[PDB]
Amino acid sequence: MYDYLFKVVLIGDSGVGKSNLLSRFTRNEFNLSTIGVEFATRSIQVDGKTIKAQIWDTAGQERYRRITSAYYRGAVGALLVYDIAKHLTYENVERWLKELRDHADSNIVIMLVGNKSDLRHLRAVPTDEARAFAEKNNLSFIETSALDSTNVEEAFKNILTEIYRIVSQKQIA
Ligand SMILES: Nc1nc2c(ncn2[C@@H]2O[C@H](COP(=O)(O)OP(=O)(O)O)[C@@H](O)[C@H]2O)c(=O)[nH]1
Ligand SMILES: [Mg+2]
């Protein structure tokens, strides 16, 4: 029973916490076997509507750039994740963002997610820097800790709400 079914993909370098964002949001689980791209669904309510989120994650193909255009196909949202404690994963955001815009559809809602906010002492990516990038690129932005749950619920509820608010206003085209 749902009003909308939104495919949202997690993308970002290996080891940034994509899988744990997914497990935290959909199962409230964290892990310190995956045979392919996979998904979990969670229904949320936004504005009196049931939004069924179909949240996709990789099997680690991003270790290679073995991420196919098929993965992005039909995604109306992406959580573009980096690790606040690994600047390279943030440098690589531009590349994923491109890969999105490209292989994904023009109206995709993209939320930039700096994960592992618990790793304060290793912070290599200032919040201001990532926020500024997000703002310039019309991305939403949030920092999460899948470990401590910090902002996980919010990150996904926010992107689903964004997608809902956008799509629900648009007549068929
Ligand atoms: N400290 C900390 N570690 C995390 C967090 N999220 C994920 N990790 C760890 O980072 C590693 C990669 O996590 P994973 O979810 O597999 O990242 P993925 O490769 O992007 O899917 C694992 O050892 C996780 O336990 C977090 O919020 N904080
Ligand atoms: Mg993973």
Curated annotation (Swiss-Prot):
Molecular function in Gene Ontology: cadherin binding; G protein activity; GDP binding; GTP binding; GTPase activity; myosin V binding
Annotated membrane topology: Lipid-anchor
Cofactor(s) for this UniProt protein: Mg(2+)
Activity regulation as described: Regulated by guanine nucleotide exchange factors (GEFs) which promote the exchange of bound GDP for free GTP. Regulated by GTPase activating proteins (GAPs) which increase the GTP hydrolysis activity. Inhibited by GDP dissociation inhibitors (GDIs) which prevent Rab-GDP dissociation.
GO biological process per UniProt: amyloid-beta clearance by transcytosis; cellular response to acidic pH; constitutive secretory pathway; endocytic recycling; establishment of protein localization to membrane; insulin secretion involved in cellular response to glucose stimulus; melanosome transport; receptor recycling
Record-listed E.C. numbers: 3.6.5.2
CC terms in the record's Gene Ontology section: cytosol; extracellular exosome; Golgi apparatus; phagocytic vesicle; phagocytic vesicle membrane; recycling endosome; recycling endosome membrane; synaptic vesicle
Motif Switch 1 per UniProt: ranges: 30-38
Post-translational modification, as annotated: Citrullinated by PADI4.
Induction, per UniProt: Up-regulated by extracellular acidosis and down-regulated by alkalosis (at protein level).
Binding annotation for GTP: 14-15, 17-20, 31-34, 60, 115-116, 118, 146-147
Catalysis performed (reactions): GTP + H2O = GDP + phosphate + H(+)
Motif (Switch 2): 58-77
Compartments (UniProt record): Recycling endosome membrane; Cytoplasmic vesicle, Secretory vesicle, Synaptic vesicle membrane; Cytoplasmic vesicle, Phagosome membrane; Cytoplasmic vesicle
Keyword Cytoplasm applies: no
Functional description taken from the UniProt entry: The small GTPases Rab are key regulators of intracellular membrane trafficking, from the formation of transport vesicles to their fusion with membranes. Rabs cycle between an inactive GDP-bound form and an active GTP-bound form that is able to recruit to membranes different set of downstream effectors directly responsible for vesicle formation, movement, tethering and fusion.
Similarity comment: Belongs to the small GTPase superfamily. Rab family.
Domain notes: Switch 1, switch 2 and the interswitch regions are characteristic of Rab GTPases and mediate the interactions with Rab downstream effectors. The switch regions undergo conformational changes upon nucleotide binding which drives interaction with specific sets of effector proteins, with most effectors only binding to GTP-bound Rab.
Disease listed for this protein: Neurodevelopmental disorder with ataxic gait, absent speech, and decreased cortical white matter: An autosomal dominant neurodevelopmental disorder apparent in infancy and characterized by severe intellectual disability with absent speech, epilepsy, and hypotonia. Additionally, visual problems, musculoskeletal abnormalities, and microcephaly can be present. Brain imaging shows decreased cortical white matter, often with decreased cerebellar white matter, thin corpus callosum, and thin brainstem.
Record's protein name: Ras-related protein Rab-11B
Part of the full-length chain shown: 8 to 182 of 218
